[PDB]
Structure formats: structure tokens, C-alpha cells
Design a protein around this ligand. Structure first.
Ligand code: VO4
Length: 282
């Protein structure tokens, strides 16, 4: 019963209502608006909740799902790279997980700069990329890892671990098993880096807005939300958090498209069922 078609239909019904309620109006006070004529939103109808926005010129949100704290964002536009790097550095980012594939990044029509696999200078910020490990996730899917060193006069230099799912499929979802492996890798990578900051006495450890994993695909609502949901199920502090709760939390804190596709919700439901976690709130 709890994972049957009726329960699943009720879950989808609740979530569809929420998506509709959260749809952005023109100049919606709930959503971040572009300053002037520079593009803010990569996709016109995928907007950034104002109250949880990380920076005034990025489409990026703080999200807390149960006890699990992250940042979800869109793939930065070329014009946003300096601001995006400053976000990454100021956050003392313990892991950046990029779920857009190499093939997507190479597709010039998508306007996704290869900002983490190449070195470059963006305004005042210079960035160096180095390749590190490669970790298989299952089904031939590979996580390629990097360290991104971000340098800027007047700022402390920050190095950010990157997990890039370079061969993420482009028109289907990855399985629950691959998602679980990816969530574990991302969480573990973050824990190692967070620990380094704690050992050094960084003030960021005490700041709820910092030390957050940063996750994006192209829009930051599909693959990204599937991963964030899996991460929250990987956190033993989140007992009794339902699938309804987690998807509602993501939507209210970013936008109504979080968990964009039914295929992605299917994975979250399967992960929840494996844990005996509820789908719905009573
Ligand atoms: O500027 V710190 O995040 O090393 O206290």
C-alpha cells in the first residue's frame, strides 16, 4: 500500500499542485529578478527563489532538506563565471558536483563554459584545474574528479574538489544504484574537505550559509534534484523525512520544477522504498 500506485498518484497530485502554486508571475516578489539587461536565468521559466538566493546575480539557492544543507544552481552562464567562482570560494565549497555531461558541455548551442576542466582568468579571478581520481559509479558511469584552485587578490585562495559525471546519459535518468553511489561519493568528498577546514579553525564551520556542497546540471532542477534527494536519504539524521517533504522543501526553496521529470521521482521513490521511508505525510 505505502508504495503502491494509489500512494504514488497521491504524491504526484500533491507535487503538481505545488508546482502550479510556485510558478513565477511577472516580477514575482518570491523570485530573484535580473538587474538590467543581463541575462540571469538560463531558462526563462526556471527561476531562483529570492529569499534563499546565494548571490544577487546568480541563479543559485540555499536548500535544506531535513538536516541536509546544499546549494543548487544552474550551470553558470559565461557572463556569470566570475560571480560563480566568488560564490564557490566564499562558500569554502567542500565539493562541486557537475551532472552535465562532457557531450553537453561541448555542445556550443547550450552555452555551458568548460569552467572546471580548464584553467583561466575571469575578471580578477584566476583558476587552475588539476585532474585527480576517477571513481566508477556503476553501469559504466564514471565520476571524474578535479581540484579547482581559485585565486584573487584580496581573497584567500580556495581549492574546491569537483566530481564531474562526464558520461552522464543525456536523455534518461541514472538508476537508483548509480545515484546512491554518486551521493556517497559527493558526501564523502565533502566530509574530507570540511574536516580540513575544521582542523584549520576556519570560521566557515560555524556559518550555516557556508561549507555547502554545490550541485548543478544544466538547469539545476532535474539531475540536481535527484542527487540532492539521494543525499538527504544518505544522512542518518533524516529519519522519518518523507518523499513529499523532501520534494516540497526543494521546490519552496528553489522553484517548482525541482525534480523536473517523473523518471527522477521514480528513482527517489525506489530509494525511499528500500529504506522503508514514507512517501506521504499523514
Ligand atoms: O577566512 V576562513 O573561512 O579560513 O576563517
Amino acid at each position: 500500500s505505502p508504495y503502491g500506485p494509489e500512494a504514488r498518484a497521491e504524491l504526484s497530485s500533491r507535487l503538481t499542485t505545488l508546482r502550479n502554486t510556485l510558478a513565477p508571475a511577472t516580477n514575482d516578489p518570491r523570485y530573484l529578478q535580473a538587474c538590467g539587461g543581463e541575462k540571469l536565468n538560463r531558462f526563462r521559466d526556471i527561476q531562483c527563489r529570492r529569499q534563499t538566493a546565494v548571490r544577487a546575480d546568480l541563479n543559485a539557492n540555499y536548500i535544506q532538506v531535513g538536516n541536509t544543507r546544499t546549494i543548487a544552481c544552474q550551470y553558470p552562464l559565461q557572463s556569470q563565471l566570475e560571480s560563480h567562482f566568488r560564490m564557490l570560494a566564499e562558500n569554502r565549497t567542500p565539493v562541486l558536483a557537475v551532472l552535465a555531461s562532457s557531450s553537453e558541455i561541448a555542445n556550443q548551442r547550450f552555452g555551458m563554459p568548460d569552467y572546471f576542466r580548464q584553467s583561466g582568468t575571469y575578471g580578477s579571478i584566476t583558476v587552475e584545474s588539476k585532474m585527480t581520481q576517477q571513481v566508477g559509479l556503476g553501469d559504466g558511469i564514471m565520476a571524474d574528479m578535479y581540484t579547482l584552485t581559485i585565486r584573487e587578490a584580496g581573497q584567500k585562495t580556495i581549492s574546491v574538489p569537483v566530481v564531474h559525471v562526464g558520461n552522464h546519459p543525456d536523455q534518461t535518468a541514472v538508476s537508483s544504484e548509480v545515484t546512491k553511489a554518486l551521493a556517497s561519493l559527493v558526501d564523502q568528498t565533502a566530509e574530507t574537505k570540511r574536516n580540513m577546514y575544521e582542523s584549520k579553525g576556519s570560521s566557515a564551520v560555524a556559518d550555516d550559509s557556508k561549507l555547502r556542497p554545490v550541485i548543478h546540471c544544466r538547469a539545476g532542477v532535474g539531475r540536481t534534484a535527484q542527487l540532492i534527494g539521494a543525499m538527504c536519504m544518505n544522512d542518518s539524521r533524516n529519519s522519518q523525512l518523507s518523499v513529499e517533504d523532501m520534494v516540497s522543501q526543494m521546490r519552496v526553496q528553489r522553484n517548482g520544477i525541482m525534480v523536473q521529470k517523473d523518471e527522477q521521482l521514480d528513482v527517489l521513490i525506489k530509494l525511499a522504498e528500500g529504506q522503508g521511508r514514507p512517501l506521504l505525510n499523514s
